[PDB]
Structure formats: structure tokens, C-alpha cells
Amino acid sequence: EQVVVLQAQRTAAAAALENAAMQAAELPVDIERRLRPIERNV
Amino acid sequence: EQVVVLQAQRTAAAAALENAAMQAAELPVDIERRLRPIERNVH
Amino acid sequence: MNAHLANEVQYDLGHVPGRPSSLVHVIISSECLAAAGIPLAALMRANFQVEIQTRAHATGDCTPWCTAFAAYVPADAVGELLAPVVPAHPGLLPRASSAGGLFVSLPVVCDAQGVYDPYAVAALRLAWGSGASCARVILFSYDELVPPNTRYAADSTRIMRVCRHLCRYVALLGAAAPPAAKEAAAHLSMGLGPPISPEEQLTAPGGDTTAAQDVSIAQENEEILALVQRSLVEWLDRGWEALAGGDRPDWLWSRRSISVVLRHHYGTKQRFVVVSYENSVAWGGRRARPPLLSSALATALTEACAAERVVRPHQLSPAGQAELLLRFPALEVPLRHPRPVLPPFDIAAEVAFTARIHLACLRALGQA
Amino acid sequence: QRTGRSALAVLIRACYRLQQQLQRTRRALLHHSDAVLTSLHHVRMLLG
Amino acid sequence: QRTGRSALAVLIRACYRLQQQLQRTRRALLHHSDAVLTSLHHVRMLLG
Amino acid sequence: LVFTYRQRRDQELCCVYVIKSQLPPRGLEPALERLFGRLRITNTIHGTEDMT
């Protein structure tokens, strides 16, 4: 009984990081948007 | 054996996860290490 | 399209089950449809009846069934939203091709002071023929149907391409265009003076709260950086009405804006699209947000147990556990009961209920 | 006496305002940091 | 007239150089941040 | 004798038709809906400007 349950759990966890990859890809771009006023500020 | 393989991959999941999850916790430590004396820097 | 909008009429008239519940639109991808269930050529053989229910968290109380509306496309499902192809003039808009499935609106159970519950099931049933077969069941967690934000601020730049190709086509069509449309192309070009890719809108790293905060923080900087160092939409509507000879709401929603968000399926790893129209009643809507719903409970489970470093929320120490009950009481039901019918806070807890019956069916055979 | 002190008052409005911009964006970056930690601890709850 | 303006020119060389140090170390910290994200998405590829 | 109307703040339409049919006057309405129902949807959506 646990086999189909445990097989589902890996495929369950194989959804959220791919949603989180689109979430974590903003971390370069949003943090790069904190210099473009401050680079021209100098 | 299908329980044996997938429970091994469960252990293969969280092992490499927590190595970079601690390394994800390394991220806000530097930003409180870098940018906190930087307030004094302009001052 | 038409099934995407007639289901919005169902929530407005109140025929849907659950008054605090809210409506969520979902584009199922064709590749998500294949690995989960039924073959694709069966739905090819224009609305289709789909029965939808909602299942509560960890206790076997489901909603009695209600039918809903659906429509399958073989072409680009996202590209049909973005680039409506008038059949009288197929050369109007260029678009990038994509796979496409069906459009289904989904109900999501909420409360007063709207907070959906995670780790519970909304489900589908696609019956393309009579009998027990031809009827697969596609599941959705409430975590699967909730993106954090919209994207229709970052997606509004597609309109200027559509404004450009109308000015392109009237110059190409010339005298065969009616003169008021031949006028209005110049009226668009006074506002003005590549093909539309749905993948480029989806893979763009832009979210509504992320983009609007970065713009609103930059314009505050630029004022300080300066002091120290010192409608065409109505013109569009006549162009559509002249070239199509008429109008449907399918052309209404494509012109205003659209929020087109990638999400990924817990069952068969495939992608699918959650859409909230601008003027709609659903997920993010310009007119109808009583009562708006929050993702605070899924936030409250993780960050409370992250500092505690506990894998499961029922494994938490009862001193730290009891603060969650005193704040949010909806989680008190699956946590307090010693023996529910479903193992709580598990995603495969639905699938275990099918297999526990499968053992009890077999165990009664060999004894009898 | 007024133009040079106003030229310094622009420099008063220059640096002392821009320092307060630093403090808020780090807190906004703490929303960017904790969104990762909300995501990461949620992944193990899908395994457990 | 020369020593006091050079004392301000040291303060010109003080703050305007140290601001440019801020911009590069954040980009170096983006190499520290993206090394986590390169690692984390690689972990799920070992599961899938 | 059948007209056509298209109500909009735009310059508007008109047609005249003479239709030969076996249908009664009591049953013409779904037939004219099958032809001119494209124009029927437009004057439901538009034609309300400016009505606040």
C-alpha cells in the first residue's frame, strides 16, 4: 500500500521547487535593481 | 525492494537538500555582515 | 474561452457550492493531460461537461457534485488568449505555437476572513464515454491552485505589438479595409508615433508585487537623484468590429489585460497555467474581490516549524503547537483527532484512501 | 550666506535621505530572503 | 586655500570611493547567492 | 422587410433586406438570430455609452 503512496510523494515534491525555481530566479534580478539608481548616484 | 529503493532516495533527497539549505541560510548572514556597517560608511 | 466565461456567470448567480469560496481559472496543458489520464484524440471527437467536487482536509466530507463547462483546443491554448485569430483575416496577428489542452474553472473552499486550507483536494472527472473507463480523475491541492501574486502589470506590453500589427495590416489591406478602420489605423499610429510568444511571457522573471515595488522605489529615488544633481482602446474596438463584422466577449478580455502564470502539477510533474482576467470576478479581479483570500495559513505552517526544524506539523512540541491553534482554529480539526479517515498533512493521503480500500477489498476475499 | 548654506542643505538632503533608502531595501530584501526559507522548509513537508 | 580643500578632497576620495566598493561586493554576493540556487535545483535533478 | 441596426458611438450601420422564406411571422425570430446574431451580441455589449 505504501509503494504508491511513497511513489506519489516524490512526484509530489517534484512540483514545488519548479514553482520555486521561478520564485528564486527573481533573486538576481530584484537585487540587481538596487544599484541602477545607486550606481548612477556616484 | 521498491520500498528499499525509494526510502534510499528519500535519504538521498534531504542529504543534498540540507547541505544547500544551510548554504541558503548563509545568504542573510552576509547581508547583515556587509550592509550593516555601510550605514556608518555614508555617515 | 466561452466555457471559460460561462463559468464566471455560475459564480455570479451563486449556483456554485460555498459562498465564502472563490473561483480559480486553470489552463490544463495537453502534456499534463496525457500522463495523468485519458488520451487526447478522444476529446477531439463547443462545450464539454465536467463534474467537479471539493474535498475537505483529512476528514471524508466532500461536496456533492456540480457540473461545469470546458472546451479543448489542439492549438496554442495561451496563444489563443493572446492572439485571437479572426477567420476572415488569418494574417492579423503573429504568434508562437504551443501545446494546448482545456479550460476549467475551479472552486476553492475558503472562510470568512478568507483563508484557504492547504493539503486538501479539489478534483476533476473527465468522462469522454459511457462506462467505468473513459473517466479519469485529476486532482488539485489548494497549494496547486494558489500562486502568490498576479503578473498582468508585467504582461501589458503585449498590447503595443497588437496595436502595431493592426497598423501593419491596414497598410497591407489598403482599400479593402473599410474607411473608418482605415482611419483608425492612423489614429493608432498617432498614439504609436516580432511575433507574440506566450513562452516569453511565461518565462519572464516578473511578478506583480516584485515589479511594482521596484518601480515605485526607483521613482522615489529619481526625485532625490534629480534634486541633488541640480483612449486608443476604443480605437482598437472599431478595428476589431470592422474586420470581424461583430464582437464576442472573447475579444473583450484579450484587449484589456491578462495575468498568465506558470504553475506545476503535483501528480505528473507537468506545467499548467493559472489565469486571472482583469475585469473578472475570479482570482484577481478589478471589480469583485469580496472577500479576498490569503495564503497566511500555508505561511503559518512552514515558518513556525522551520525554526523548530520539525518535518511534520503534528510532530511539533505541544507548547509551540498550541499557539497555532489559538491563532488559527481551522487546523484544530485534523490535529486534535487521534484517528481520522485520512493521514493528515500528507499529499498522497488521497491516494492512500484508494489503496486502503484496495486492501480491505482483497482481505475480505481470501478469508471468505 | 544663503546660497552656500543651501548648497550644503542639498548635501544635507543628499546623504541623510539616501541613508534611509538603505534601511528599507534591506528589509524588503528580507522579504526576498524569507520567501526562500518559506519555500525550502515547505519542500521537506512534501516529503514527510 | 589649498590644505583645507585638499582635506575636503580626502573626504571626496573617502566617500565617493567607498560607495563604489558597495556596488561590487553585492555583485560578488550575487555569486554567493546563485551558487546556492545552482546547488538547490541540482538536488531535485538527482531525484527526478 | 428586414432592417439591420448596429448601435455604437461610432458611425452606425443600416441595411435593408427582402427575405423569401417558408417560415411564418411567428417563427422568423430564430432564423434572423442565426444570420444576424453576430450583430446581436455587439449591441448588447456596446450601445451603452455614455450611460454612467
Largest sheet of chain D: none
Please outline the major beta sheet of chain F: 2 strands, antiparallel
Secondary structure category of chain D:
mainly alpha
Which geometry of chain D do the CA atoms define?
A: rod-shaped
Q: Strand percentage of chain D, roughly?
A: under 5%
Spell out the key features of this protein.
part of a larger assembly, 6 chains, C: 368 residues, alpha+beta, eight-stranded antiparallel beta sheet, F: 52 residues, two-stranded antiparallel sheet, 1 helix, elongated, viral protein, tegument
Describe this structure in words.
- The PDB classes it as viral protein.
- Keywords: tegument, portal, DNA-packaging, capsid, viral protein.
- Herpes simplex virus type 1 (HSV-1) portal vertex-adjacent capsid/CATC, asymmetric unit.
- Chains A, B are Capsid vertex component 2.
- This is part of a larger assembly, with two copies of chain A, one copy of chain C (368 residues), two copies of chain D (48 residues) and one copy of chain F (52 residues).
- By secondary structure, chain A is mainly alpha-helical.
- Helices cover 81% and strands 0% of the residues of chain A.
- Chain A starts with a helix and ends with a helix.
- Helices cover 42% and strands 14% of the residues of chain C.
- Chain C is globular, with a radius of gyration of 24 Å.
- Chain D has one helix and no strands.
- With 48 residues, chain D is mainly alpha-helical.
- Chain A binds chain E through residues 10, 13-14, 17-18, 21, 24-25, 27-28, 31-32, 34-35, 38-39, 41-42, and chain E through 16, 19-20, 22-23, 26-27, 30, 33-34, 37, 40-41, 44, 47-48.
Compact description:
Chain A: This is DNA packaging tegument protein. Chain A is an all-alpha fold.
Walk me through the topology.
The structure is cut from a larger assembly and holds two copies of chain A, one copy of chain C (368 residues), two copies of chain D (48 residues) and one copy of chain F (52 residues).
Chain A: H1 2-13, H2 16-24, H3 26-32, H4 36-41
Chain D: H1 3-47
Chain F: E1 2-6, E2 13-17, H1 29-45
Antiparallel strand pairs in F: 1-2
